[PDB]
Enzyme design. Structure first.
Site, PDB file in Angstrom:
ATOM      1  N   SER A  78       0.836  -1.195   0.000  1.00 56.36           N
ATOM      2  CA  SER A  78       0.000   0.000   0.000  1.00 56.36           C
ATOM      3  C   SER A  78       0.874   1.249   0.000  1.00 56.36           C
ATOM      4  O   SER A  78       2.078   1.161   0.233  1.00 56.36           O
ATOM      5  CB  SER A  78      -0.912   0.004   1.234  1.00 56.36           C
ATOM      6  OG  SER A  78      -1.866  -1.054   1.176  1.00 56.36           O
ATOM      7  N   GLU A 128     -11.051   0.778   2.565  1.00 58.04           N
ATOM      8  CA  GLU A 128     -10.826   2.075   1.944  1.00 58.04           C
ATOM      9  C   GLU A 128     -12.071   2.581   1.192  1.00 58.04           C
ATOM     10  O   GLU A 128     -12.424   3.759   1.295  1.00 58.04           O
ATOM     11  CB  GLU A 128      -9.635   1.987   0.995  1.00 58.04           C
ATOM     12  CG  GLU A 128      -9.424   3.210   0.130  1.00 58.04           C
ATOM     13  CD  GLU A 128      -8.326   2.999  -0.867  1.00 58.04           C
ATOM     14  OE1 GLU A 128      -7.234   2.539  -0.466  1.00 58.04           O
ATOM     15  OE2 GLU A 128      -8.544   3.292  -2.060  1.00 58.04           O
ATOM     16  N   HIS A 178      -8.187  -4.544   3.227  1.00 55.65           N
ATOM     17  CA  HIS A 178      -7.740  -3.166   3.346  1.00 55.65           C
ATOM     18  C   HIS A 178      -8.294  -2.252   2.230  1.00 55.65           C
ATOM     19  O   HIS A 178      -8.630  -1.096   2.480  1.00 55.65           O
ATOM     20  CB  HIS A 178      -6.220  -3.150   3.333  1.00 55.65           C
ATOM     21  CG  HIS A 178      -5.632  -1.853   2.895  1.00 55.65           C
ATOM     22  ND1 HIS A 178      -5.551  -1.489   1.569  1.00 55.65           N
ATOM     23  CD2 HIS A 178      -5.084  -0.842   3.605  1.00 55.65           C
ATOM     24  CE1 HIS A 178      -4.979  -0.301   1.482  1.00 55.65           C
ATOM     25  NE2 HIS A 178      -4.687   0.112   2.703  1.00 55.65           N
ATOM     26  N   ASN A 179      -8.369  -2.767   1.002  1.00 58.87           N
ATOM     27  CA  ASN A 179      -8.892  -1.993  -0.127  1.00 58.87           C
ATOM     28  C   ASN A 179     -10.404  -1.845  -0.082  1.00 58.87           C
ATOM     29  O   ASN A 179     -10.947  -0.818  -0.487  1.00 58.87           O
ATOM     30  CB  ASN A 179      -8.479  -2.623  -1.448  1.00 58.87           C
ATOM     31  CG  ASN A 179      -7.021  -2.403  -1.765  1.00 58.87           C
ATOM     32  OD1 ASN A 179      -6.283  -1.782  -1.003  1.00 58.87           O
ATOM     33  ND2 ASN A 179      -6.596  -2.917  -2.902  1.00 58.87           N
ATOM     34  N   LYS A 226      -4.623  -7.482   2.164  1.00 59.11           N
ATOM     35  CA  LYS A 226      -4.534  -6.286   1.322  1.00 59.11           C
ATOM     36  C   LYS A 226      -5.864  -6.007   0.609  1.00 59.11           C
ATOM     37  O   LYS A 226      -6.291  -4.857   0.482  1.00 59.11           O
ATOM     38  CB  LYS A 226      -3.383  -6.449   0.316  1.00 59.11           C
ATOM     39  CG  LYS A 226      -3.342  -5.453  -0.828  1.00 59.11           C
ATOM     40  CD  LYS A 226      -2.958  -4.056  -0.377  1.00 59.11           C
ATOM     41  CE  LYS A 226      -3.022  -3.083  -1.558  1.00 59.11           C
ATOM     42  NZ  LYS A 226      -3.153  -1.657  -1.118  1.00 59.11           N
TER      43      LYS A 226
HETATM   44 CL   LIG Z   1      -2.979   2.661   0.103  1.00 60.65          CL
END
Ligand SMILES: [Cl-]
Ligand SMILES: NC(=O)c1ccc[n+]([C@@H]2O[C@H](COP(=O)([O-])OP(=O)(O)OC[C@H]3O[C@@H](n4cnc5c(N)ncnc54)[C@H](OP(=O)(O)O)[C@@H]3O)[C@@H](O)[C@H]2O)c1
Ligand SMILES: Nc1ncnc2c1ncn2[C@@H]1O[C@H](COP(=O)(O)OP(=O)(O)O)[C@@H](O)[C@H]1OP(=O)(O)O
Ligand SMILES: O=C(NO)[C@H](O)[C@H](O)COP(=O)(O)O
Ligand SMILES: [Cl-]
Lengths: 469, 469
Positions: free
Chosen positions: A130, A193, A189-190, A186
Site C-alpha cells: 500500500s 478504503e 484493506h482496499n 490487502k
Molecule cells: Cl494505500
C-alpha cells in the site's frame, strides 16, 4: 560482470518497481534491476548512477547477479503478465530461491502460484504493498504471505523499507500467514478504503444538502473532526480537496469533477459472499460507485421521480456533531464487518491471521491510516479469539453513546431525501447483530413451504419438514 | 422398453412432481434416481399412472423412444456434472438433454459449447413454483440453441403453468446457451429480496405494533387482496395459520432463525458485482441470511449491545397502512434492480433477453408472481430499451405517492431499533437513482489526490488531472 553481487532484485521498472528498488538500495543494499523493455531500465540506471544498482539486460543476467538464496520481487502488471514473468524466471532459479509478488493480486492467484512453485522447490511470497508510488519510494504498508522460513530471510529488508508508525516507530509490515494470506489482508484493506470514502461522501452530502454549508464551512468541520477520535488521513485529504480552486475556471475543483466513480474494488465483497460473511457497508460502498456511473439514467430520473423538498430548521451545530458521531459509529461497523471477514477467511484457509498486528501495520504507509486503529489492536491484545470488535469494551461504549445520534441522522436524512446507503446500512447491521431473534424463522418456513428445504427447531435437535398441505 | 415419451432423472421433490406433471398430460414417463429406493417409493405409490421404473441409466436410456427427451432435476454442481457425464455416452444423435436444476449459468454456458457439435441437443432451463409448481404448472425459463428449444417447446407448454389472465403458457425462449439459467438466477435474487422485505414487515408488526400471529395473518390476508397480491404474501398468510406439529403454539415460532441458502441469491449478487450493476436490496437480503446464521454471536451481542426501548403510542391502523405502501414500494425496487441486471447481462453475453416476455412467464407457476407483472410487460412494450422500470409512468406514479410512507416507516423502525436493511436499502436506492448529482465527485477528487487516477469534468469533455501540490 556482477555475478552474485546483488542482495535483492526487482523486476518491473515502471514507477512502483523503480521506487521500491530505490527504497531498498537506500537502506544499504546492492539491488539488481530488470524490465522487459530495457530502455526503461536504462533510464533508471542513467539517472541513478550514484546508487548501488546493477543494470541487467536479460533474465539470465538478472538471476546470475543475485546472491543465493535469491530474493526477487515482481512489480509487474497483475494477472497474466505476472504469470508470464514467473514462467520466464522458473528455469533460471535454484531450489530454495524466493519470489515475491508485490502487485495488487487477487489472492486465489497467489494461492495457486505458491502451490505450483513449491512443487518446483521455489518459495513464493505474495505481498500487498500500500501507499502508491510515494509509499513505494519512502515507506509502504506491507502485507506479506507465503513460506515462513523464506519470509524470515526477506523480513529485515521489508522492515527497513516499510513505513514506520509515527506513534512508536514500528515498521508497518509483518508476516500474515501461509500462501495467499498476505494478498487477502490487502484486499480487505482496499474494501475498507472504499467504505471509509463512501462514509465521508455521505457526511459531506448531508452537510451540503441538508445544512446548506459552503465548501469553506465543510473544510473547517472536517479539520475540527480530525483533531478528535476520527483523526485519519482520508479526512485530512478531504479537507485539503475542499480548499482547492478550479484550475480551468471559477470556484472549486471539487464542484467541477464529474460524479462518475472509477475495477478490483469488488473483490472483498465477492469473498464475503463466497464465505457466508455479512459485509453490507463495504458492498453498499461498491454499489454507490456503480450507481454513480449510471449518471445518464440519474439525470433522466432527476427530472421525473419525485421527492421531498425540505428546508432544515433545527440547530446546525447540534446536527453537525450528530453526523460526526454517525461517521465514527458507522466506520466502526465497517471495520467490525471487515475483521469478521478476516476471521472467517483465517478459519477457512487455516492462516492464523494476526488481527491486532494488521491494525498496527495499517497505521502508516496507506490511505486508511487513522489513530483509532490502536483501539482495534487493543481489542485483540485483550483477546485474540474475539469474534467481533463490537463485543470489546471500547466499541461497546462508543456504540452505546453514539447510536441515538445515528438514528436521528437517519430520520433526518431519509425525511429530507438525501441518500445515505452506508449510514443506513451501519445502523441496520448494529440492530441485526444485536438481535437475539431475527425474522429468519419466517424465511425458513416459506422455503420449507414451497421448496421442502427443511429447518431446525428452537426446542430440540434435528432436521424437520412440516406438511404444509 | 422403448415405450417412454419422456424421462426424468432425479426423484427428490422436484423431479418426482415433474414426472407426475408430464404423465398427467397423457405420456408414459421413465423415472430414475441414483438411490433406487426413492424410485421404488414413487412407482409403488402411483401404480395407477403410466410410469416406467428403471434402476440403471442404461435401462433408463433404453426405455425411451428416440429421439429421447431427458430432463435432470439433480442437485446443482458436481452431482449434475457427473450425472450428465455418465449419461452422454449412452445417448444418440438427435436426443434432447435438459438440465432443469438451479445450475450456475457459467456451467451451462460451458456445457453448451462442449456439446455444440455432438448431435445431442441441449437445454438449460430454470424451473419455478416449488413442489406444487412442478406438479401442476411451473414457470419455465429455457435457453440453448433455438432448434433445441423448438423440439421441447410443445411439451414444455403443456406442463407449464398457464397465466390466469389469458391462458398463455409460462414458458418461452430466453436465449442462447446459459440465458435460461441466468434468468432463473435473477428470479431467485428478486425472491430473496421480497422474502426479506416480508420478514422485516413481519418483524415490525410483531415487535413495534405488538401484534399476534392471528392479527398479522389477517393483515397479510387483506394485503393480498390489494395491489400486493403475490405468491410470497399468499403463502405468508398460510404459514401464519399453522400450529406446531410437535408441541403447542405456532410452527413459525418454533422454527430456528437460521436462514439457509443454496446459492442462487449469492450468484445474483456476484454477477451484479462483476457487471457493474448496483444491486443493493437483493445483496442486503443475502447478507441478512448470512447474519441470521451467526446465531451464537447474536445471542452474545444481545446481552452486551444496548439499544432503544420505545413503546409505540400512535395509531396502529395508520402505521400498518404505511408499512403496506412501503412494502409495495420496496417490492418494486427489488424488481427494478433485477431487470436492470438482466439488461446489463443481456448486453455482456449477447442474449437479447425478452424482458417483457420474462415478466409474462412469471405470472403463474412462479414464486415471484405479482400483480404488477403486466405493468412490467406494458412498460417494455412501450419502450423495448427501457433502462429501468422506475422511468415508466406507472411506477413513477406509485413511487410519487408511496414514498412519504416509506420514509415514516424507515424513521419509525430506526428510532425503535428494529433492523430493516432492505427497507432502508430501498429508499436509499430510490434517493440515489433520482439524484442528478451524487457525492462521487468527492470520491473522484480523493482518488486523483492520492493516486492520480484522473477524472472527468462537469463542464467539458476529456480526462483531467489536478496538480494538488
Ligand atoms: Cl494505500
Ligand atoms: N426444491 C425446490 O423448491 C427447487 C425449485 C426449483 C429448482 N430446484 C433445483 O432442482 C434440482 C433438484 O432439486 P430438488 O429440491 O428436487 O433436490 P436436490 O436436493 O437439489 O437434489 C437431489 C437429487 O440429486 C441427486 N444427487 C444428490 N447428490 C448427488 C451426488 N453427489 N451425485 C449424484 N447425484 C446426486 C439425488 O439422488 P439421491 O436421492 O440418490 O440422493 C436426488 O435425486 C436442484 O438443482 C435444485 O436447485 C429446486
Ligand atoms: N506481458 C508482460 N510480460 C512481462 N512484463 C510485463 C508484461 N506486461 C506488463 N509487464 C510489466 O509490468 C509493468 C507495468 O505494470 P502495471 O500495469 O502495474 O503498470 P503501472 O502500475 O505503471 O500502470 C511494466 O514494467 C511492464 O514492463 P514493460 O515496461 O516492458 O511494459
Ligand atoms: O429455485 C427455487 N425456488 O425458486 C429453489 O427453491 C431454491 O432452492 C430457492 O433458493 P434458496 O434455496 O437458495 O433459498
Ligand atoms: Cl506457503
Amino acid at each position: 560482470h556482477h555475478m552474485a553481487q546483488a542482495n535483492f532484485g526487482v523486476v518491473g521498472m515502471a514507477v512502483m518497481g523503480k521506487n521500491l528498488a530505490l527504497n531498498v538500495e537506500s537502506r544499504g543494499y546492492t539491488v539488481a534491476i530488470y524490465n522487459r523493455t530495457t530502455s526503461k531500465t536504462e533510464e533508471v540506471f542513467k539517472e541513478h548512477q550514484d546508487k548501488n544498482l546493477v543494470f541487467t539486460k536479460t533474465l539470465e543476467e538478472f538471476v546470475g547477479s543475485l546472491e543465493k538464496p535469491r530474493r526477487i520481487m515482481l512489480m509487474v502488471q497483475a494477472g497474466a503478465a505476472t504469470d508470464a514473468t514467473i514462467k520466464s524466471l522458473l528455469p533460471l532459479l535454484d531450489i530454495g530461491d524466493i519470489l515475491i509478488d508485490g502487485g495488487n493480486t487477487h489472492f486465489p492467484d497467489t494461492m495457486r502460484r505458491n502451490a505450483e512453485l513449491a512443487d518446483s522447490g521455489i518459495n513464493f511470497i505474495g505481498t500487498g504493498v500500500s501507499g502508491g508510488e510515494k509509499g513505494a519510494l519512502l515507506g509502504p504498508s506491507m502485507m506479506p504471505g507465503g513460506q515462513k522460513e523464506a519470509y524470515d530471510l526477506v523480513a529485515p529488508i521489508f522492515e527497513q523499507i516499510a513505513a514506520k508508525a509515527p506513534q512508536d516507530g514500528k515498521p508497518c509490515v509483518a508476516y500474515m500467514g501461509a500462501n495467499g494470506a498476505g494478498h487477502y489482508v490487502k484486499m480487505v484493506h482496499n474494501g475498507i478504503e472504499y467504505g471509509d470514502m463512501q462514509l465521508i461522501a455521505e457526511s459531506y452530502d448531508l452537510l451540503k444538502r441538508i445544512l446548506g454549508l459552503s465548501n469553506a464551512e465543510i473544510q473547517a468541520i472536517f479539520e475540527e473532526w480530525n483533531e478528535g477520535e476520527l483523526d485519519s488521513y482520508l479526512i485530512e485529504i478531504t479537507k485539503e480537496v475542499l480548499k482547492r480552486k478550479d484550475d480551468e475556471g471559477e470556484g472549486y475543483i471539487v464542484d467541477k469533477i464529474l460524479d462518475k466513480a472509477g475495477g478490483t474494488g469488488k473483490w472483498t465483497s465477492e469473498s464475503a459472499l463466497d464465505l457466508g460473511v455479512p459485509l453490507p457497508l463495504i458492498t453498499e460502498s461498491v454499489f454507490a460507485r456503480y450507481i454513480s456511473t449510471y449518471k445518464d439514467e440519474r439525470v433522466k430520473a432527476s427530472k421525473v421521480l419525485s421527492g421531498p423538498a425540505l428546508d432544515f430548521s433545527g440547530d446546525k451545530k447540534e446536527v453537525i456533531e450528530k453526523i460526526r458521531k454517525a461517521l465514527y459509529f458507522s466506520k466502526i461497523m465497517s471495520y467490525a464487518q471487515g475483521f469478521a471477514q478476516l476471521r472467517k477467511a483465517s478459519e477457512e484457509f487455516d492462516w492464523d491471521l494476526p488481527y491486532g498486528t494488521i491494525a498496527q501495520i495499517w497505521r502508516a504507509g496507506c490511505i486508511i491510516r487513522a489513530e483509532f486503529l490502536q483501539n482495534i489492536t487493543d481489542a485483540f491484545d485483550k483477546d485474540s479469539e474475539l469474534e467481533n470488535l463490537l463485543l470489546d469494551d471500547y466499541f461497546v461504549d462508543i456504540t452505546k453513546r453514539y447510536q441515538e445520534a445515528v438514528r436521528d441522522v437517519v430520520s433526518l436524512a431519509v425525511q429530507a431525501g438525501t441518500p445515505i446507503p452506508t449510514f443506513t446500512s451501519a445502523i441496520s447491521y448494529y440492530d441485526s447483530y444485536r438481535s437475539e431473534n431475527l425474522p429468519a424463522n419466517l424465511i425458513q418456513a416459506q422455503r420449507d413451504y414451497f421448496g421442502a428445504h427443511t429447518y431446525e427447531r428452537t426446542d430440540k435437535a434435528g432436521i424437520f419438514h412440516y406438511d404444509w398441505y
